Design a protein around this ligand. Sequence first.
Ligand SMILES: O=C1NC(=O)[C@@](c2ccccc2)([C@]2(c3ccccc3)NC(=O)NC2=O)N1
Ligand SMILES: [Ca+2]
Ligand SMILES: [Ca+2]
Ligand SMILES: [Ca+2]
Ligand SMILES: [Ca+2]
Ligand SMILES: [Cl-]
Ligand SMILES: [Cl-]
Ligand SMILES: [Cl-]
Ligand SMILES: [Zn+2]
Ligand SMILES: [Zn+2]
Ligand SMILES: [Zn+2]
Length: 158
Amino acid sequence: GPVWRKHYITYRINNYTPDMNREDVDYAIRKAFQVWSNVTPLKFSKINTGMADILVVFARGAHGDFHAFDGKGGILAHAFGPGSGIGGDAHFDEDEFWTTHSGGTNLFLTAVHAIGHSLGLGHSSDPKAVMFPTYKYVDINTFRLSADDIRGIQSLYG
Ligand SMILES: O=C1NC(=O)[C@@](c2ccccc2)([C@]2(c3ccccc3)NC(=O)NC2=O)N1
Ligand SMILES: [Ca+2]
Ligand SMILES: [Ca+2]
Ligand SMILES: [Ca+2]
Ligand SMILES: [Ca+2]
Ligand SMILES: [Cl-]
Ligand SMILES: [Cl-]
Ligand SMILES: [Cl-]
Ligand SMILES: [Zn+2]
Ligand SMILES: [Zn+2]
Ligand SMILES: [Zn+2]
């Protein structure tokens, strides 16, 4: 792909944004993984110790890779495709204001997109797809992947 060569994938939250209650961050990240397990045989486990496949990091500016962040706006997050070490990891720009609601940038929606990259998906050219390369705020209560996103991930895993 690269794709993960297993269906049991671990993640760990490296650090928490002070923008949100910790329980809200946990829920947003858990649900973002669940979106993808809903349409594939992938199974994600949150681990609290040891080395996870996907490390979730909040950082600002230059943060140890070739993808330095840019302050508020613009780059919200980036993620590496499947592989060892930094492979799979998902980084969120701390200069954004992360929220559960309509203010700032919505963490769950950003994480669904970032995790798609952590799984090996590229971008969609369809403006309505979750994997379109522009952030779009939508209602979480009615949230669904587009057919294009579903076809993409199932091609990789299903
Ligand atoms: O304009 C963008 N800013 C983003 O962070 C990004 C994005 C993030 C979450 C959801 C949709 C879009 C994007 C990005 C980041 C840096 C430069 C360009 C795009 N980060 C990413 O993982 N895919 C992207 O398209 N697109
Ligand atoms: Ca499943
Ligand atoms: Ca990793
Ligand atoms: Ca930014
Ligand atoms: Ca912040
Ligand atoms: Cl922390
Ligand atoms: Cl599952
Ligand atoms: Cl778990
Ligand atoms: Zn980048
Ligand atoms: Zn990074
Ligand atoms: Zn993207």
